[PDB]
Amino acid sequence: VVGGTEAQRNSWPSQISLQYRSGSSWAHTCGGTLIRQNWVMTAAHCVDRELTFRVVVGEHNLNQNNGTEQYVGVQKIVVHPYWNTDDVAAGYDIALLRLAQSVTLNSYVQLGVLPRAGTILANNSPCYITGWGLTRTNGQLAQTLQQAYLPTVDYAICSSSSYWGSTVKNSMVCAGGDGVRSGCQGDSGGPLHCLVNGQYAVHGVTSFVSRLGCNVTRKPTVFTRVSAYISWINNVIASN
Numbered sequence: 357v358v359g360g361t362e363a364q365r366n367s368w369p370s371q372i373s374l375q376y377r378s379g380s381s382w383a384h385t386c387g388g389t390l391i392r393q394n395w396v397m398t399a400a401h402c403v404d405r406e407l408t409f410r411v412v413v414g415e416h417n418l419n420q421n422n423g424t425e426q427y428v429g430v431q432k433i434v435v436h437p438y439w440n441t442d443d444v445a446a447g448y449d450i451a452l453l454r455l456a457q458s459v460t461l462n463s464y465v466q467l468g469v470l471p472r473a474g475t476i477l478a479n480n481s482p483c484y485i486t487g488w489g490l491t492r493t494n495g496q497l498a499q500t501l502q503q504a505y506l507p508t509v510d511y512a513i514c515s516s517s518s519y520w521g522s523t524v525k526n527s528m529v530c531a532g533g534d535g536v537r538s539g540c541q542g543d544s545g546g547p548l549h550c551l552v553n554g555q556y557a558v559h560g561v562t563s564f565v566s567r568l569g570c571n572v573t574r575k576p577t578v579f580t581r582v583s584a585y586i587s588w589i590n591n592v593i594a595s596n
Protein backbone atom coordinates (compact mmCIF):
# COMPACT_ATOMS: atom_id res chain seq x y z
CA VAL A 357 0.00 0.00 0.00
CA VAL A 358 1.41 3.32 -1.13
CA GLY A 359 0.38 6.30 0.95
CA GLY A 360 -1.10 4.22 3.73
CA THR A 361 -1.13 4.46 7.48
CA GLU A 362 -0.42 1.66 9.95
CA ALA A 363 -3.59 -0.23 10.77
CA GLN A 364 -4.59 -0.81 14.37
CA ARG A 365 -3.96 -4.52 15.02
CA ASN A 366 -7.69 -5.36 15.54
CA SER A 367 -9.19 -3.25 12.77
CA TRP A 368 -9.12 -5.79 9.92
CA PRO A 369 -9.26 -9.25 11.53
CA SER A 370 -10.22 -11.02 8.25
CA GLN A 371 -6.97 -9.95 6.54
CA ILE A 372 -4.50 -12.81 6.00
CA SER A 373 -0.93 -13.03 4.70
CA LEU A 374 -0.42 -15.60 1.94
CA GLN A 375 3.19 -16.79 2.05
CA TYR A 376 5.34 -19.24 0.13
CA ARG A 377 8.20 -21.36 1.29
CA SER A 378 11.54 -19.82 0.28
CA GLY A 379 14.56 -21.81 1.44
CA SER A 380 14.40 -22.22 5.18
CA SER A 381 11.97 -19.33 5.45
CA TRP A 382 8.55 -18.11 4.37
CA ALA A 383 7.97 -15.03 2.23
CA HIS A 384 4.85 -12.90 2.04
CA THR A 385 3.48 -12.77 -1.46
CA CYS A 386 -0.20 -11.74 -1.34
CA GLY A 387 -3.11 -10.89 0.84
CA GLY A 388 -6.39 -12.70 1.31
CA THR A 389 -9.62 -12.63 3.28
CA LEU A 390 -10.65 -15.32 5.75
CA ILE A 391 -14.22 -16.22 4.72
CA ARG A 392 -14.74 -19.48 6.69
CA GLN A 393 -12.62 -20.89 9.49
CA ASN A 394 -11.04 -23.16 6.83
CA TRP A 395 -11.38 -21.04 3.66
CA VAL A 396 -9.54 -18.00 2.34
CA MET A 397 -10.49 -15.85 -0.64
CA THR A 398 -7.58 -14.49 -2.67
CA ALA A 399 -6.65 -13.55 -6.25
CA ALA A 400 -6.11 -16.35 -8.79
CA HIS A 401 -2.91 -14.75 -9.96
CA CYS A 402 -1.44 -15.11 -6.51
CA VAL A 403 -1.49 -18.86 -6.79
CA ASP A 404 -0.32 -19.20 -10.45
CA ARG A 405 3.11 -20.36 -9.31
CA GLU A 406 3.67 -23.97 -8.27
CA LEU A 407 4.75 -23.04 -4.73
CA THR A 408 4.15 -24.35 -1.23
CA PHE A 409 1.72 -21.86 0.36
CA ARG A 410 0.67 -21.11 3.91
CA VAL A 411 -1.75 -18.64 5.35
CA VAL A 412 -1.11 -16.54 8.46
CA VAL A 413 -4.13 -15.23 10.34
CA GLY A 414 -3.75 -12.81 13.23
CA GLU A 415 -0.71 -11.30 11.55
CA HIS A 416 0.29 -7.67 12.07
CA ASN A 417 4.08 -7.39 11.71
CA LEU A 418 5.57 -9.78 9.13
CA ASN A 419 8.98 -9.46 10.79
CA GLN A 420 8.14 -9.74 14.54
CA ASN A 421 6.20 -12.00 16.86
CA ASN A 422 2.80 -10.40 17.49
CA GLY A 423 1.66 -13.12 19.88
CA THR A 424 -1.55 -13.52 17.89
CA GLU A 425 -0.59 -15.42 14.72
CA GLN A 426 -1.90 -18.79 13.60
CA TYR A 427 0.02 -20.45 10.75
CA VAL A 428 -1.83 -22.92 8.55
CA GLY A 429 -1.00 -24.82 5.42
CA VAL A 430 -3.01 -24.55 2.23
CA GLN A 431 -4.62 -27.93 1.51
CA LYS A 432 -6.56 -27.24 -1.71
CA ILE A 433 -6.56 -24.41 -4.23
CA VAL A 434 -9.69 -23.78 -6.33
CA VAL A 435 -9.07 -21.13 -8.96
CA HIS A 436 -12.00 -19.68 -10.90
CA PRO A 437 -12.32 -21.94 -13.99
CA TYR A 438 -12.44 -18.96 -16.40
CA TRP A 439 -9.18 -17.40 -15.05
CA ASN A 440 -6.45 -16.91 -17.63
CA THR A 441 -3.09 -15.83 -16.22
CA ASP A 442 -1.93 -13.96 -19.33
CA ASP A 443 -5.23 -12.00 -19.47
CA VAL A 444 -5.85 -10.41 -16.03
CA ALA A 445 -8.02 -7.79 -17.80
CA ALA A 446 -10.58 -10.45 -18.67
CA GLY A 447 -11.36 -10.79 -14.97
CA TYR A 448 -12.04 -13.94 -12.96
CA ASP A 449 -9.05 -13.06 -10.74
CA ILE A 450 -10.28 -15.03 -7.72
CA ALA A 451 -9.37 -18.25 -5.96
CA LEU A 452 -10.43 -20.08 -2.83
CA LEU A 453 -7.92 -21.79 -0.53
CA ARG A 454 -9.06 -24.58 1.78
CA LEU A 455 -6.89 -24.57 4.87
CA ALA A 456 -5.44 -27.72 6.44
CA GLN A 457 -6.89 -26.76 9.82
CA SER A 458 -9.76 -24.55 10.93
CA VAL A 459 -8.47 -21.42 12.60
CA THR A 460 -9.70 -20.15 15.96
CA LEU A 461 -11.61 -16.86 15.96
CA ASN A 462 -10.79 -13.93 18.29
CA SER A 463 -10.40 -10.13 18.05
CA TYR A 464 -7.51 -10.66 15.64
CA VAL A 465 -9.08 -13.47 13.51
CA GLN A 466 -12.62 -13.07 12.15
CA LEU A 467 -14.52 -13.96 9.00
CA GLY A 468 -14.85 -11.28 6.36
CA VAL A 469 -18.39 -10.41 5.58
CA LEU A 470 -19.18 -10.36 1.91
CA PRO A 471 -21.72 -8.13 0.13
CA ARG A 472 -24.99 -9.37 -1.12
CA ALA A 473 -24.86 -10.70 -4.64
CA GLY A 474 -25.10 -7.99 -7.32
CA THR A 475 -24.33 -5.07 -5.06
CA ILE A 476 -22.64 -2.18 -6.88
CA LEU A 477 -21.20 0.75 -4.90
CA ALA A 478 -22.13 4.33 -5.81
CA ASN A 479 -19.27 6.38 -7.18
CA ASN A 480 -16.96 7.74 -4.48
CA SER A 481 -18.02 5.24 -1.85
CA PRO A 482 -15.75 5.05 1.21
CA CYS A 483 -13.37 2.09 1.29
CA TYR A 484 -10.03 1.07 2.68
CA ILE A 485 -7.44 -1.18 1.05
CA THR A 486 -5.29 -3.14 3.47
CA GLY A 487 -2.07 -5.10 3.03
CA TRP A 488 1.65 -5.56 3.44
CA GLY A 489 2.50 -4.73 -0.19
CA LEU A 490 5.09 -2.30 -1.40
CA THR A 491 4.99 1.13 0.15
CA ARG A 492 6.31 2.81 -3.00
CA THR A 493 6.41 1.84 -6.65
CA ASN A 494 9.48 -0.40 -6.98
CA GLY A 495 9.88 -0.25 -3.22
CA GLN A 496 9.73 -2.85 -0.47
CA LEU A 497 7.02 -4.62 1.49
CA ALA A 498 5.62 -3.00 4.62
CA GLN A 499 6.51 -4.65 7.93
CA THR A 500 3.25 -3.70 9.58
CA LEU A 501 -0.20 -3.96 8.03
CA GLN A 502 -1.10 -0.78 6.17
CA GLN A 503 -4.44 0.79 5.24
CA ALA A 504 -5.28 3.48 2.72
CA TYR A 505 -8.53 5.29 2.10
CA LEU A 506 -9.49 4.63 -1.55
CA PRO A 507 -12.93 5.99 -2.66
CA THR A 508 -14.57 3.91 -5.40
CA VAL A 509 -14.53 5.01 -9.03
CA ASP A 510 -17.64 3.71 -10.76
CA TYR A 511 -17.60 1.70 -13.97
CA ALA A 512 -18.61 4.58 -16.21
CA ILE A 513 -15.64 6.66 -15.08
CA CYS A 514 -13.17 3.80 -14.60
CA SER A 515 -13.74 2.41 -18.09
CA SER A 516 -13.41 5.86 -19.72
CA SER A 517 -10.45 6.51 -21.96
CA SER A 518 -8.30 8.50 -19.55
CA TYR A 519 -8.79 5.88 -16.82
CA TRP A 520 -8.61 2.17 -17.66
CA GLY A 521 -10.68 2.11 -20.86
CA SER A 522 -11.53 -1.42 -22.07
CA THR A 523 -9.33 -3.11 -19.51
CA VAL A 524 -11.82 -2.63 -16.68
CA LYS A 525 -14.89 -4.81 -16.70
CA ASN A 526 -18.16 -4.62 -14.79
CA SER A 527 -16.97 -7.65 -12.79
CA MET A 528 -14.34 -5.37 -11.16
CA VAL A 529 -14.33 -2.52 -8.66
CA CYS A 530 -11.99 0.43 -9.11
CA ALA A 531 -10.87 2.51 -6.14
CA GLY A 532 -8.46 5.37 -5.62
CA GLY A 533 -6.51 6.83 -8.51
CA ASP A 534 -5.51 10.06 -6.75
CA GLY A 535 -1.78 9.62 -7.51
CA VAL A 536 -0.85 9.39 -3.80
CA ARG A 537 -2.59 6.28 -2.37
CA SER A 538 -2.93 2.87 -3.95
CA GLY A 539 -2.46 -0.81 -3.76
CA CYS A 540 0.93 -2.14 -4.85
CA GLN A 541 2.70 -5.42 -5.41
CA GLY A 542 2.14 -7.76 -2.51
CA ASP A 543 -1.35 -6.36 -1.78
CA SER A 544 -2.94 -8.58 -4.48
CA GLY A 545 -5.51 -10.98 -3.19
CA GLY A 546 -6.33 -8.88 -0.15
CA PRO A 547 -9.51 -7.05 0.69
CA LEU A 548 -11.09 -3.76 -0.23
CA HIS A 549 -13.29 -3.00 2.80
CA CYS A 550 -16.23 -0.68 2.13
CA LEU A 551 -18.53 0.85 4.68
CA VAL A 552 -22.19 0.21 3.79
CA ASN A 553 -25.17 0.62 6.17
CA GLY A 554 -22.81 1.00 9.01
CA GLN A 555 -20.93 -2.26 8.43
CA TYR A 556 -17.63 -2.87 6.54
CA ALA A 557 -17.84 -5.63 3.96
CA VAL A 558 -15.18 -6.97 1.62
CA HIS A 559 -16.29 -5.71 -1.81
CA GLY A 560 -12.99 -6.29 -3.63
CA VAL A 561 -10.10 -8.71 -4.05
CA THR A 562 -7.03 -6.71 -5.08
CA SER A 563 -6.18 -7.65 -8.69
CA PHE A 564 -4.00 -5.14 -10.55
CA VAL A 565 -2.42 -1.74 -10.84
CA SER A 566 -0.82 0.10 -13.79
CA ARG A 567 2.39 -1.20 -15.41
CA LEU A 568 3.49 2.45 -15.08
CA GLY A 569 3.40 2.31 -11.32
CA CYS A 570 1.25 1.75 -8.25
CA ASN A 571 0.03 5.24 -7.42
CA VAL A 572 -0.68 6.72 -10.86
CA THR A 573 -3.32 9.41 -11.24
CA ARG A 574 -6.40 8.07 -13.10
CA LYS A 575 -5.21 4.49 -12.74
CA PRO A 576 -7.16 3.44 -9.65
CA THR A 577 -6.36 0.13 -8.11
CA VAL A 578 -8.53 -2.58 -9.67
CA PHE A 579 -10.22 -5.32 -7.64
CA THR A 580 -12.27 -8.36 -8.49
CA ARG A 581 -15.89 -7.45 -7.53
CA VAL A 582 -16.78 -9.94 -4.82
CA SER A 583 -20.51 -9.41 -5.28
CA ALA A 584 -20.24 -10.86 -8.79
CA TYR A 585 -18.91 -14.17 -7.40
CA ILE A 586 -21.17 -14.98 -4.44
CA SER A 587 -22.73 -17.99 -6.13
CA TRP A 588 -19.37 -19.23 -7.32
CA ILE A 589 -17.91 -18.95 -3.82
CA ASN A 590 -20.85 -20.71 -2.25
CA ASN A 591 -20.75 -23.47 -4.88
CA VAL A 592 -17.04 -24.10 -4.31
CA ILE A 593 -17.39 -24.28 -0.54
CA ALA A 594 -20.44 -26.56 -0.77
CA SER A 595 -18.65 -28.98 -3.11
CA ASN A 596 -15.42 -29.12 -1.12
Ligand code: NA
Nearest residue numbers: 417420421422
Ligand atom coordinates in the same frame (compact mmCIF):
# COMPACT_ATOMS: atom_id res chain seq x y z
NA1 NA B 1 4.07 -11.25 13.23
